[PDB]
Amino acid sequence: AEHVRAPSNGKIKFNEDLVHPTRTRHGHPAFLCSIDLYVTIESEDILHN
Amino acid sequence: TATSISLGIDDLLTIPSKGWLVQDAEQQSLILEKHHHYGNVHAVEKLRQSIEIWYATSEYLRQEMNPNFRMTDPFNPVHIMSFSGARGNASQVHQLVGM
Amino acid sequence: LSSEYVIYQPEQEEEELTGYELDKRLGRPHPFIDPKTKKKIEKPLTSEELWWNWRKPEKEQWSRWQRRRPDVETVFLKAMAETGQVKLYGDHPTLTETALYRAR
Amino acid sequence: VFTQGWDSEKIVDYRINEEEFHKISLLDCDFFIRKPPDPDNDVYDFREMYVTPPDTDIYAIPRVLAPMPQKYIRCAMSDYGCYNVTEPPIDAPRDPMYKSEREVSKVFLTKHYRNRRAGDPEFALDFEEIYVIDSKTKSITRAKVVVTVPGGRNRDRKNDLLVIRDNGTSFKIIPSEERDDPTTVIEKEEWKKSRQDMERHLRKLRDFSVSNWF
Amino acid sequence: MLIGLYVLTSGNHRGICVNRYNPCNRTKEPFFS
């Protein structure tokens, strides 16, 4: 229901070791998190998690 | 009577970013429809994605409508009529100015 | 004799030497992001490397939203950028500039 | 009787006569500083101080975080808070529609110049010695004043203006000629907050970092 | 009636929308008794 959106333009950096491979209902490739993770958005000036 | 509020054609304002959301939504819909013909996805998935990639897009627009009005054009006649509770509802306003 | 709780600073002067900070404090036309500070992001994954969903098509597709929507704000921004009333980043006003002009 | 004890925050195992103290009521606390006899009751003595919850008899030693005066000093009190108007429920034919409370949070004690009386023909105030009384931390400290005015000590202390900002934490002494009218500072703060909010709203658009703020 | 009351009690702009430059560099209506 709730869709997390990107705060600003940049690169998404996260550690792929804690996330396990999956297949979305919509058929796209994806990653499932069973634990808390912190993604970083390398933007021009600031970051976001 | 002294203020004489009125609603116009140009007075109806759309969220700055609509051409981007609709464009990326239709681009994703095209990519899906291509792949469907190649066998990478099945119809149920196509059916589902279509409904969702559209519902999410629309809601971003509706939720974003109020901030735009309060931040950019505070005294917009449609915003005055909606926020005051006189006439209209958020749902009605969305249909007029969003999607 | 003066304790630490009392500080004497006669004729204290604080100003911004660089032009960007001065224009930001006063409110004059200035870019949102400091070009000095701006640093290029390292190359991201190429289109080929992305999963299919995110890959960009090789041929530029058609759309009814490819053309920008004409508004009064763009015309007024161009008219006031001429004659030197405001300064815009580039020759064409962008959407954020129009949204800001809608307020001011 | 003059009595001083350890700095531990607990009861003193007795009660004090409040007639010989100053009762400065706060939001969640109340302080008692001893008052020597005087024509005008403004002489304090920071050697004995007690803290107590509002309307209680459980006295205790407060938290002292600054060197306190060990001599009779003449000061003036000034409260620092914000009114809290609430809408109470109406269950009566003439129930009050609103309720007003002062809700003081800090109390400033400004020592007079040379311990002079208010009736003196040449009266002044010493802003370099100000003692704040916090109500949330039960602490009484000193004010880190920043004296920025040409003249030094030779300048007469009759043209001064203490400006307090940042929730009673910033003190600056400036001459009364370069003061700011209330509308000026109101507009300054409103403009700063509005610009911060506007930059936040716009930061979430893709056309950022290529735009200009006109 | 609600529209009239809202226009009455709405006020006006207060920050960047009423002043162009920062007021830190430089009077209102007279004090009405």
Q: How was this one solved?
A: cryo-EM
Q: Considering CB atoms only, which of B17, B20, B71 is closest to D201?
A: B71
| Contact between chains at E28 and D190 (C-beta distance less than 8 A) | no
C51 touches chain B (CB under 8 A): no
Distances (CA, A) of A46 to A40, C41, C44: 10, 12, 17
Q: Count other Cβ atoms within 10 Å, centred on residue D70.
A: 9
Beta carbons within 8 Å of C77's beta carbon, 6+ residues apart: C86, C88, C93, C97, C98, C101
Half-sphere exposure of E7 (CA within 13 A, CB side): 13
The resolution, in Å, is 3.0
Number of other residues whose CB lies within 10 A of the CB of residue D183: 12
Handedness of CA C64, C67, C69, C70 (dihedral sign): negative
The alpha carbon torsion through D140, D144, D150, D152 (nearest 10 deg) reads 60
Q: For residue B31, what are its two tokens?
A: 């990519």
Structure tokens at B8: 């116009």
State whether C25 and E17 contact (CB < 8 Å).
no
What Rg do the C-alpha atoms of chain B give, in angstroms? 18
Size of interface B-C (CB pairs under 8 A): 35
- C98–B16: do the CB atoms touch at under 8 Å? yes
| Alpha carbons within 13 A on the beta-carbon side of D9 | 8
CB contact under 8 A, A27 and B49: yes
From B71, which residue of chain D is nearest by alpha-carbon distance? Answer: D198
Question: What are the chain D neighbours of A8 within 8 Å (beta carbons)?
Answer: 203-204, 208
The residues, any chain, with a CB within 8 Å of residue C103's CB and separated by 6 or more, are B71, B72, B73, D198, E16, E17
**Could you give the C-alpha distances from C103 to B70, B75, C72, C82, D90, in angstroms and in order?**
10, 10, 14, 20, 42
Q: What is the rounded distance in angstroms from the CA atom of residue D6 to the CA atom of residue D3?
A: 11
Picking from D188, D194, D198, the nearest residue to E24 by CB comes out as D188
The neighbours of chain B, by the rule of 3 or more Cβ pairs under 8 Å, are A, C, D, E
D85 - beta bridge partners?
D100
Q: Mind telling me how many Å the CA of E26 is from chain D's nearest CA?
A: 8
